[PDB]
Design a protein around this ligand. Structure first.
Ligand SMILES: CC(C)(COP(=O)(O)OP(=O)(O)OC[C@H]1O[C@@H](n2cnc3c(N)ncnc32)[C@H](O)[C@@H]1OP(=O)(O)O)[C@@H](O)C(=O)NCCC(=O)NCCS
Ligand SMILES: CC(C)(COP(=O)(O)OP(=O)(O)OC[C@H]1O[C@@H](n2cnc3c(N)ncnc32)[C@H](O)[C@@H]1OP(=O)(O)O)[C@@H](O)C(=O)NCCC(=O)NCCS
Ligand SMILES: CN[C@@H]1[C@@H](O[C@H]2O[C@H](CO)[C@@H](N)[C@H](O)[C@H]2O)O[C@H]2C[C@@H](N)[C@@H](O[C@H]3[C@H](O)[C@@H](O)[C@H](N)C[C@@H]3N)O[C@@H]2[C@@H]1O
Ligand SMILES: CN[C@@H]1[C@@H](O[C@H]2O[C@H](CO)[C@@H](N)[C@H](O)[C@H]2O)O[C@H]2C[C@@H](N)[C@@H](O[C@H]3[C@H](O)[C@@H](O)[C@H](N)C[C@@H]3N)O[C@@H]2[C@@H]1O
Ligand SMILES: [Cl-]
Lengths: 260, 260
């Protein structure tokens, strides 16, 4: 029965630990926030108020081409190329990355399935030079979030949607990492070309693990007393430092893979 | 029962009457088109291929401020002012105006409740200088649609959502037109100010007619033979000359006003 404002959301964000100059990747379930006077745009505006102009807000866009269409040779010349300026975010990830992507000023990185939207003082740097292959590795917004000592805010989102952990999956040395190869269309100086891609499998976990095991790792991280929980509006939310939870998740995975 | 492509939708638009250099207002129910390979963006892409670069495609954006919150004094300072670059389309008009508005190169006119989104060769003209009061009058994208001799296409949409006919309500001489007055926040060169507004009532029909009466007027115009029906992908869709349906509607309303 409580309605949120740009001002009250800024206090909530400061209360969970958002600070001046932060860079924050956000995963959101916006319905959990509850009634907002100015719609969910008040959340992004509140965040920009807190972190200031030097800060950056990010979201995981991906794109909408499903595998079964991509793999259907009949529709091959009817599939539109991925275009960081025009391709819309995968709807599976909710409105939040679309909200960012279509805010004037936002930029969107180049590696389609891993592509990120960002707005703020380092939006250019965070989206620049996104490797097409292994796009969850060091040459990616996720690696740059670790380098920048950014944060990840789960805004009512289930903890297994923390995509930053796919970057730990990339770094961790464990046996039998599944490698995925696929063909997708992209623009090379404004013209459509089909390109072969390669990356570590993000869609399914390492064999032996439950499909939602990212959530277990996050809770085990919060159990050490690092990170913070809080209400953003009415959404139960989590804020964690990106570098710490990736080091935690790397050795969680490296230790598990040794037992096999 | 089949998939539509940017090229399949292209030939469907040419058969309804879309032609080179056209400027067309679109009201859409996109779930009625069926499955499209590259999503509803393939619709707007097709149209811009049919009409060519001099063409122009429009949508009725409006905005999301709710009367209730607007008229709550306690919420006054928390209302985001209307911003033609940022305030999102009213969701009751469907995704289509948002689809246009969030396309790079697209423009949005200044008068909030009557705001229109536009992309194409004449997008700057169709959106320039939209009057804040009586925003369905002559100083309006709908007035310019008549002057440009454009078209309207109901793309699976209920024919009573044809907003151009509100422009016929502004123009037609019939007694007891209901004037609406309200205060609303608007961005004036980046700064929010509350401004009083007035216009003819678009939210309820003139006292004496059914709510969906716009619809019966449309198909009656179709009985004259001066419209064209046809299926866009899977959607039953109507295309109509703008200048003629206004005159047909104006005379309809003025003639009916005397009987009353
Ligand atoms: C799946 C998931 C998104 C569902 O969350 P949800 O709250 O149900 O859906 P969304 O987050 O899209 O938010 C919905 C709110 O959009 C607002 N919204 C959407 N578009 C809007 C618009 N154009 N204008 C105003 N509001 C809009 C609404 O409040 C809509 O709610 P309503 O339609 O019920 O009114 C959530 O559980 C989740 O998993 N989030 C994280 C996803 C992620 O980042 N995944 C990474 C890869 S694993
Ligand atoms: C109310 C009305 C809009 C409902 O239409 P609808 O087809 O059910 O809904 P929309 O037209 O918004 O289109 C829905 C399709 O959006 C696609 N779409 C929406 N957003 C998308 C996105 N971001 N990315 C990819 N696809 C998206 C989907 O196919 C969505 O369907 P799904 O959610 O079932 O998959 C329609 O009946 C109507 O009355 N239209 C006319 C509105 C108008 O012009 N009013 C004028 C003022 S009175
Ligand atoms: C860990 N579980 C996740 C699942 O959870 C969601 O669906 C479940 C269905 O039972 C629900 N129980 C659960 O509540 C809900 O959150 O959603 C699927 C969606 C699917 N397109 C893919 O996305 C991945 C992309 O394929 C990949 O490209 C991207 N990099 C990462 C995406 N997560 O894999 C995830 C993953 O399997
Ligand atoms: C006449 N019907 C319309 C309704 O759609 C539905 O109407 C009937 C129910 O009422 C249904 N039977 C019908 O299937 C369906 O089309 O949507 C509402 C949405 C509301 N924001 C307002 O928009 C108006 C704006 O408020 C106003 O600012 C603008 N100028 C004109 C808009 N129509 O009034 C319309 C109008 O009442
Ligand atoms: Cl995918």
């Amino acid at each position: 029965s409580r309605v949120s404002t740009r001002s009250s959301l800024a206090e909530d964000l400061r209360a969970i630990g958002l600070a001046d100059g932060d860079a924050v990747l956000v995963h959101a379930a916006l319905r959990k926030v509850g009634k907002i006077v100015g719609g969910p745009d008040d959340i992004l505006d509140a965040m920009r108020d807190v972190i200031g102009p030097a800060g950056t807000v990010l979201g995981y866009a991906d794109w909408q081409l499903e595998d079964e269409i991509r793999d259907d040779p009949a529709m091959r010349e009817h599939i539109p190329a991925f275009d960081p300026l025009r391709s819309r975010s995968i709807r599976d990830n909710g409105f939040w990355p679309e909200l960012i992507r279509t805010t004037p000023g936002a930029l969107r990185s180049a590696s389609p399935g891993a592509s990120m939207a960002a707005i703020g003082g380092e939006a250019e740097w965070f989206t620049a030079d996104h490797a097409l292959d292994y796009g969850y590795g060091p040459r990616s917004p996720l690696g740059k979030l670790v380098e920048a000592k950014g944060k990840v805010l789960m805004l009512g989102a289930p903890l297994d949607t923390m995509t930053l952990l796919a970057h730990a999956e990339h770094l961790a040395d464990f046996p039998n990492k599944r490698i995925l190869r696929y063909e997708a269309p992209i623009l090379v100086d404004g013209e459509k070309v089909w390109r072969w891609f390669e990356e570590f499998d993000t869609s399914d976990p390492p064999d032996g693990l439950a499909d939602d095991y990212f959530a277990g790792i996050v809770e085990e991280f919060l159990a050490t007393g690092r990170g913070k929980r809080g209400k953003i509006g009415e959404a139960s939310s989590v804020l964690v430092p990106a570098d710490e939870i990736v080091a935690f998740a790397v050795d969680w995975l490296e230790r598990w893979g040794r037992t096999a």
